Design a binder for this molecule. Sequence first.
Ligand SMILES: NC(=O)C1=CN([C@@H]2O[C@H](COP(=O)(O)OP(=O)(O)OC[C@H]3O[C@@H](n4cnc5c(N)ncnc54)[C@H](OP(=O)(O)O)[C@@H]3O)[C@@H](O)[C@H]2O)C=CC1
Ligand SMILES: NC(=O)C1=CN([C@@H]2O[C@H](COP(=O)(O)OP(=O)(O)OC[C@H]3O[C@@H](n4cnc5c(N)ncnc54)[C@H](OP(=O)(O)O)[C@@H]3O)[C@@H](O)[C@H]2O)C=CC1
Lengths: 315, 314
Amino acid sequence: ASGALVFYSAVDIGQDWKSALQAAHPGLDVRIARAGDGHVEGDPEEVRYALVWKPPHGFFARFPNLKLVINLGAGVDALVARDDLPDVPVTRLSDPNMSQMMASFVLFCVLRHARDIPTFERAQREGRWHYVHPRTAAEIRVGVLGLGDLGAAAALELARHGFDVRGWSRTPKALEGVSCFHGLEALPGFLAGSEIVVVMLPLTPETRGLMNAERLAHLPRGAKFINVARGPVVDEAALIAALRSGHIAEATLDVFEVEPLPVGSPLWAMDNVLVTPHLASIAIPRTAAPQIVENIRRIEAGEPVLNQVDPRRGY
Amino acid sequence: SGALVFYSAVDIGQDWKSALQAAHPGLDVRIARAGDGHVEGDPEEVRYALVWKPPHGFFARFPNLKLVINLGAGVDALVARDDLPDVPVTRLSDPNMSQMMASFVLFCVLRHARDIPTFERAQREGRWHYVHPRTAAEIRVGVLGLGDLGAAAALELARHGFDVRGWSRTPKALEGVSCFHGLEALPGFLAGSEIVVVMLPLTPETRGLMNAERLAHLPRGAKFINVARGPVVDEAALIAALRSGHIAEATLDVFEVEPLPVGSPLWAMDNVLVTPHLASIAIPRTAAPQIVENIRRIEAGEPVLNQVDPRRGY
Ligand SMILES: NC(=O)C1=CN([C@@H]2O[C@H](COP(=O)(O)OP(=O)(O)OC[C@H]3O[C@@H](n4cnc5c(N)ncnc54)[C@H](OP(=O)(O)O)[C@@H]3O)[C@@H](O)[C@H]2O)C=CC1
Ligand SMILES: NC(=O)C1=CN([C@@H]2O[C@H](COP(=O)(O)OP(=O)(O)OC[C@H]3O[C@@H](n4cnc5c(N)ncnc54)[C@H](OP(=O)(O)O)[C@@H]3O)[C@@H](O)[C@H]2O)C=CC1
């Protein structure tokens, strides 16, 4: 006995999401809220599901019969910090296609550093052919901070390519072919062995500024630093200082403390830093829709929903 | 077992010697002198030769040679020699080398597929510009050559969700890859390849295969990767196709003349990535086992692994 789904995003095409959802669930009542103020036509009491990205303040209070919130990203740090969040299950998008895209992107980042590509790019700009003897993957230790839906998938993929892979999480995890560390006490040792490090942590009060000057100093000199998580997990000023002193040799950064990265940032002009504009992975309507309609079915049947977030923890 | 002679001006003989002796205790390994190939000891005891571009007449020093092993996966220079002895000729081709090449090809493809050169151009201008990412399933990737390296790369590309196709001389079946074969099918193979990866050996048939005409069969805006041999591509024709925008971007590990001459237009192109011929390499420790296994086989009268056809050139 399905109710209506309301959609809000200023940065996603409502019609694409609507078409995909209706293909997965014929006859689903989908209402596209208006960008900016969230105004939506129809009876708001019929709305039971909300698929959103950064909706206006008070948006959820429009819909008193809301049974389910779905964030349009894998991250929920802004959503869970809201004062108007209703006391219902909160879910995020986290499908195998998103997983694959993120894992492939992380692999690209790691391989790019592992195969000395920034050295060749620097040399190419000078018109210089200079052979550098390649290293095998087995020689290189790669650490993944976070072993969740995305982090574990990336770690497992890195392991397939022959890297000596390690992972860090909050609680114990077993992951075949990956050296698993857990807890804050183990973090220095985890970092000490990570020649290449990949940040795949959600942003929470515990992770905010985790990679500060002290944590960066635990990485071995010449480490390669990749952030595909959230910018404020890293103390950006401290990363810059560590890049400038040569403690961090190179970095690939998809996320930043302030996005877009301000024009004045020293990171722009550094030829040992690769800046991507926060697009490591995204949900695609056609492949994201099935899990959404499955959660609609579950909420109406009284079954527990997939990909539920803990609003207190923030992931 | 007889003695193995080693020749290379660009590989450390001691590392190869140590690895071979670990895999085959007591193996008589003789390091020939760089430049002229002079070696101490009785040359009649030498039965195996592990070489990279040895001097002219090098093999004629060793009349009891039973086996040649090239220190690369490619053998185009070796098989063109007038002094090559009529014995089995093998190349290095181990699963570690395979993995390294496959990972490198994956890096190249992902770099193009995820629009990285666009972000690098933008970064150099201090400009933040979002470009909506494409799923791997939307992107067709073609691999020219489906051998030890080519098939491994194609299979890896398929794991990442790309619509992968492959081209070879004779029919091949490769799970999850659209296989084309023969010269008649090449235009159609290329026409569907948004990203193309050259993984062909250099032979008279493949030399200049990717000429102006073949490049024109690729769709406009194609991304072009060469990790094979430079002369498979008509370099001047590639440059012209880059300049006209028919080829959007390229990643080139190999060139007609290596090192790439300083005057080449390719150096200064921000849509071209130049790497200095190092896509994949043999590592002594993991390459040695197959070499000592072929020594065992040649002495037992068993057929050798990774034999090349000197007439065909691979
Ligand atoms: N750049 C981009 O475009 C994108 C970025 N992201 C970001 O990636 C993040 C990761 O996604 P995903 O893997 O699915 O997240 P998950 O919620 O599935 O997993 C989070 C992981 O982080 C660990 N973790 C959380 N807090 C701590 C802590 N204080 N100390 C140690 N480990 C901690 C968890 O450990 P445990 O389970 O034991 O608690 C778990 O291993 C998202 O939250 C989002 O911020 C996601 C998609 C795209
Ligand atoms: N850049 C670098 O650092 C490196 C480059 N290489 C290069 O990679 C090349 C390929 O390696 P590898 O996969 O092991 O080689 P293989 O010898 O195992 O396979 C060769 C492939 O090329 C195909 N082929 C040959 N001639 C033609 C033709 N005329 N038309 C169509 N297809 C053709 C073959 O088809 P069929 O099977 O039907 O015969 C086969 O699939 C090597 O020759 C070497 O030059 C290798 C390692 C490192």
